[PDB]
Symmetry: D2
Subunit: 454 residues, 4 copies
């Protein structure tokens, strides 16, 4: 039925880091688990002495790499499961997400004509915010495997602090795998292009994309023709990210490294802060202010230029390009109107932020059949609009942030597969928001690559 | 002071391999835990679907590098804790053990003048054999954290199948960390050598090694002066190994690649002295998997039998797939080893000859601790080298037990550690280990042996 | 008026090499200079103790590289002046030829999707065969600056053996320069693509080629995006070749190196043997049999399958792929009929030869205005036909052999510049056959690159 | 026994630079040939359009590497024939001189623990100063193959402007060859070290250097063991240099790159002891060109004047653009050098301090030959190092005269060369050179100096 853990050290914080961290977690914190302090402390004590998912050296490396995005010289690709589950944390599914993301990154690398830094939603994306604490069945809402259970049973939905330790054990495990995969041949560039050629061959819309797939093949053969040294072509770096929601988890995964000493959050390389949680004097923003990881903020349609600037000033006080990513998620019918003024006010500060586009969360809607769904064409249209805004202003479309899987699910309408509302019942397997399946995520990759080319 | 942690099914292995496997595991198995079989089946069912600790392509890469050891063109360095514990599975401890190993590997690379394959006793070394069924305090013996608890307490010593899952969790976590470390510049050659130079400053015997340390420093500077793209100098490959002993664990971590069947709890495993029953389940398991394998050869070993191991575990003549590990004792290796090497080189197979200068040189001190004398250890390595020099075969590698902690479990070395001192920091959970300073010392002496 | 040289050693040949070389030069030799033996010996003695233009190590390297062409995995680009002159042996003109050739090689590399081994007609192409010893003015025919003078003066046309030493001094000098250029930044791949982009921008037919120039730009940016190591991109190897015509020069430039000892001809990396000189028991073919350099044979429209095979057997006796290049030069109206049977008979021997195409020398004709000229469209058409033959037979179009310059001469009709017979008078500067100028050689590069793509 | 060889115009240099240049060359010039000025103009007109021996980007690359010498992070090695001859401009001789130089550079790279910039006296070193106007046989002095002939014969000694063109022809030919050699694996580090090991076998003093040779071998093996992409180990950069003396030649080889004016007969040139008249044409020429430049500083040098050279030849404070070359004598370098270094480091400019331990240590032996004692040479390098050690400045490089021929022109070394022996192979055309074995010997001793 269960395995067991014993309960025990960490070195003392510089007094200022202690004071600022304490000051930060004192502030109110939205969407937290409602569970006993007695027990959360115990779990935290376990987590305070485990090996971290990531290490500082990798996080400052990611920081430099992201600095190049902010300056206009690279492109950010963030993707993966909306909600990871302990039950799907298997080699096939991890391998599938890494695969999908890599396939997209080849196309975006060739189309942006510049590097793509590749960030997975993985090894920690186990918690989610909800708008209601009672879902559409009278049950306490599901909030991710880190908090409670998906199964629609009263007792499954109780907030269980032991999931804090499970969440880490899965996280670590998955990360161990992706490291391995990416270092050992799965991320070989020729092997991924091969899968892309397969997609063109068997997709219905193969013709739509054969020309560009071929041009990539030839720019790739060109490398061998010029006798380049192929070592950089045999691996790729995938970085872990998740939404920093459960502050009991994040605080327990903090560690102290350097160039004076600083707090890194080693549950991941980079975290972001959601629409529901970005309260400006709230605890998530203050926590972000204390950690050295690159951080993202979701910006929704109620966002105002002046506010946005307040985020930039609190999170990027030292003008470190790449430290802060602002992620727009307006919806295709609104991004062209709402985003331009925000970008004007922010670029006018002298701060170099990464303008990332989330074309997913502003475009959900309820199918006639009862499924949370997103139509492919609206997703494409929001990325289109994003690009138009940035071209018109002379600013860098920094990247994109999508929800995808390597499984061939049926959760988003449209795309080359003409997935109908009737088809959604076949393999609707998400534990929260609907995902672009393997074919739709790759097709979106091609389309955005054409936007990049212009 | 305890809290509990609750717990899909994918394809099963192909029926024909499941059949061969069932047949192989029906052989009797030594040293297995006495826990119920339904519980055990359950935990195995869990592990059968978790993400592996290693992936196959890494293992075939290791087989290639080891193939170069067997052919005489590289050298194997295998080291780490005797018995990993869950409570000492922390970032500092893993960091220090990786550190110590890398530090040895630098010196042995300069001295061997050939690559060193770096293998760590780590991520999975949670089970041990035991001779007695009742230990000195009248309790069930401690069999390793995979099986029971170290605490001298009736309940801690009960055999608990859930410790399988716990072990897996500690194994991947730790593995994850070494993967990150070796990729983020803890294995930057320049940095590791820096630590070695601090050691020459600090060590009571720093003068006996200033020469070789300086010579290494100048070969490194030499690489920089020749302007030689130092990317390969920024990272190292460290492989995971442990004694494959608990066949419930090892069998549940089997996974399928033509297609071969791999064990993805480690890159390589070995069969210990007490489990290599030629007709037992451990050797059979070693026959089925594709992982490299090692076998401990003790003083009771005969040439005739070693040949049986070659015929069994290297059927298709793959160089480096089998390592034979001498652990005789320094007063015995010179007599007992040469005949075995003779008989086995005769057969045509290319094996790795690896020296374990530790597990046959342990004695009990009047301070009450079980310990090992540094000089006896060094001397088994000296004898190992003298054997192979005499016979024209390749001295393949070492296989030592070490730590990065400044610990006090082995007598001697430059710190001249007394039996009085043993009580200071005797932190081991099983055998005594060379501490950080002693392991580096040994690396310098073995370095002189290779020149 | 003149500089002076003193007359002097070499080590003795293995007796078998001596015997075979003696046996070879005893055979009759066509198109030789008619000048005193007394003096030719003297010049030879000077040349027997000079530093060579090339060294053996480079020639066996070229041999391996050409082996890859024969096996179908690379492509051969040979080009340069028809006839070098001592008077045009200046840094600007050498730099111009290297430049032109490099520009072509970028395009052909990208279009073949495989390496291009780059061979210049340079540092030795100072002698030529003639069909008549009296030209159209009653003067002894001009035979290249190695033999006599271009100037139409009786005394200029006397065969002067001192030109053997001049020829070397210029050769060495030019080679010194190209080495330098190619090693020091002229052959940087980005710097050459830049010139190509300039061509597209200012050419009249820019539109014809903008798409492919852009695709090359993007496959080139792709390399940096993937973080390749750029050292191989900063230089390129250019090899010297010329027609081995004056056997007094070639024999004096022989040296003995290794893997038993062999005779290398170090006046160049590779030599070829012309239509006028390929007599099968003649001295040129026998000389080729003795040297270790890769060798080419010109094959004209009177060529027969069986003969061709005799060349292959004499020149490639050890079946060393890449050792022998057969160079077709039929003319566009004839290549499709004459070449296929030859290729059938030769491939049927088990020998792997490089099928190189010379679309120049079969397409000369006399303008209405009196200029030796070649029409661009016929040149293109012969390369087209060459490719068609090889596709139809499943054999490798190995390369091409053109006559080009970096100067903006007017010597070939047609191309994007619509160069008319009236325009030929402007800058007709060749010392023998008409050359594709810079723009026409690059346009031809694009067209052949499209044939390679198919 | 002679045969004769007969002989476009492109843009001229920009008028404003032609103006500055004419103004600079109107200064008086020492040691120039006494040949007619119309003939000379003609030959210059020829050279003004020929292909250069070097190209500018190579020169600015050299300026970068030398900038690293001046800053203390690299070391300069300059060596080759004293006086190149047309008749010894052969593949074997160039091959042997490049060989000898590379062989020294390997040892000095291991010993310096920093890159060595490798500069050869080659492709252009065809003119020499002379003290006497009438030599010992009562003939016009031999001024170098660029000017007249070595043969003791009234006619050979006439100053012949066509030897300009001849020299150019020999300079590019030779240059071509070194370019090919260094690019085709005569500069493959593994091969060059091989020759060094043959030397330790062969040399009468092979035992004094077996230690350092072995240590180098093991650092090389070390690079291979760390698996370090050895492309940069397959080739070397060798630069051409000569004493810029015949201003007709050097001026005709000027060529225009913002745009700078370069001298493309060599990568770098120097002004000798007899031509550095501060207000003369040689220093002026050095002011105008962008090439690196060196100046010989003799025993009559004063600190005050050296400063004038710095102010003149390094106006825009470019580190490494100017090298100052000490040639005092071993009994003099310790006294005479320190004040100069003092005065010049004072000025703020970063120069290269280079030791010429040869041109101030030459004496006539009773066998009649002019020669140099090996120990005196070594000792001027020792004193040079001791000076710079004392003052905290960087000992920048050496500047020796050597050959790859097994020649007998300098006394001493491991072969203990007697004055009896000098007559054996005294093949030089001017100063006596260290032979192949002696130059390598010197490299090992200087290597010990750098440690
Ligand atoms: N290492 C480079 C190139 C590369 C290797 N594998 C890849 C897979 C996908 C995209 C790019 C790559 C990068 O990550 O950009
Ligand atoms: N190219 C490097 C290393 C090197 C290659 N070949 C060499 C020969 C000698 C000395 C050094 C080298 C250098 O010039 O330093
Ligand atoms: N060195 C490679 C790539 C290259 C460098 N410079 C070039 C110039 C033109 C064409 C290719 C190249 C080659 O020669 O193929
Ligand atoms: N990567 C090489 C060299 C190397 C890098 N870091 C190291 C640390 C220790 C020893 C060797 C290395 C190896 O594993 O051999
Ligand atoms: N985990 C601690 C913070 C901490 C981090 C690192 C330390 O070294 C010490 C303390 C907390 O949440 O309060
Ligand atoms: N040059 C000589 C041939 C030769 C070549 C190399 C030698 O080493 C000797 C002789 C000839 O033409 O007859
Ligand atoms: N994912 C399964 C098995 C597992 C256990 C521990 C770590 C990783 C995976 C679970 O959480 O129960
Ligand atoms: N090492 C501790 C904490 C831990 C829990 C789970 C996985 C990894 C580590 C234990 O085993 O109890
Ligand atoms: N090309 C000129 C000048 C020159 C001389 C010698 C070598 C190279 C070029 C000539 O032949 O007269
Ligand atoms: N070195 C010989 C031959 C030679 C001629 C021309 C150029 C180069 C070399 C000479 O100067 O006479
Ligand atoms: Cl604290
Ligand atoms: Cl006990
Ligand atoms: Cl001969
Ligand atoms: Cl004299
Ligand atoms: Mn979501
Ligand atoms: Mn043990
Ligand atoms: Mn022609
Ligand atoms: Mn001299």
């Amino acid at each position: 039925m269960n395995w067991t853990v014993d309960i025990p050290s960490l070195p003392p914080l510089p007094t200022d880091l202690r004071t600022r961290l304490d000051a930060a977690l004192a502030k109110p914190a939205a969407q937290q688990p409602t569970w006993p302090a007695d027990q959360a402390l115990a779990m935290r004590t376990v987590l305070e002495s485990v090996p971290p998912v990531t290490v500082p050296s990798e996080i400052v490396r990611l920081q430099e790499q992201l600095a190049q995005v902010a300056k206009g010289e690279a492109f950010l690709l963030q993707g993966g499961d909306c909600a990871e589950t302990f039950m799907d944390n298997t080699e096939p599914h991890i391998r599938g997400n890494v695969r999908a993301l890599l396939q997209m990154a080849v196309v975006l690398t060739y189309g942006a004509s510049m590097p793509v830094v590749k960030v997975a939603r993985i090894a920690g994306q186990y918690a989610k915010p909800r708008s209601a604490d009672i879902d559409a069945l009278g049950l306490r809402s599901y909030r991710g495997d880190m908090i409670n259970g998906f199964a629609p049973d009263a007792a499954a939905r109780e907030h269980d602090p032991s999931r804090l330790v499970r969440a880490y054990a899965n996280a670590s495990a998955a990360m161990n795998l992706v490291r391995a995969l990416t270092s050992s041949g799965l991320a070989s560039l020729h092997l991924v292009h091969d899968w892309n050629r397969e997609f063109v061959r068997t997709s219905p819309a193969g013709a739509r994309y054969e020309a560009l797939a071929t041009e990539i093949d030839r720019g790739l053969r060109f490398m061998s023709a010029c006798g380049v040294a192929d070592r950089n072509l045999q691996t790729a770096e995938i970085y872990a990210s998740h939404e920093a929601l459960v502050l009991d988890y994040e605080r327990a995964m903090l560690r102290l490294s350097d160039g004076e000493p600083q707090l890194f959050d080693l549950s991941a390389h980079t975290v972001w802060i959601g629409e529901r949680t970005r309260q400006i004097d709230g605890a998530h923003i203050a926590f972000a202010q204390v950690i050295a990881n690159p951080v993202g903020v979701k910006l929704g349609p109620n966002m105002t230029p002046e506010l946005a600037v307040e985020y930039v000033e609190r999170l990027d006080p030292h003008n470190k390009p790449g430290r802060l990513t602002l992620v727009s998620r307006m919806g295709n019918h609104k991004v062209r109107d709402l985003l331009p003024p925000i970008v004007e006010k922010v670029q006018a500060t002298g701060h170099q932020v990464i303008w990332q586009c989330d074309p997913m969360h502003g475009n959900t809607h309820e199918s006639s059949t009862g499924f949370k769904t997103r139509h492919f064409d609206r997703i494409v249209d929001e990325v289109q609009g994003f690009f138009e805004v940035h071209r018109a202003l002379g600013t860098h479309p920094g990247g994109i942030h999508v929800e995808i899987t390597g499984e061939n699910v049926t959760e988003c309408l449209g795309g080359a597969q003409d997935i109908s509302e009737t088809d959604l019942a076949g393999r609707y397997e998400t534990a929260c928001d609907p995902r672009l399946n393997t074919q739709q995520s790759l097709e979106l990759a091609f389309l955005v690559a054409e936007m990049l080319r212009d």
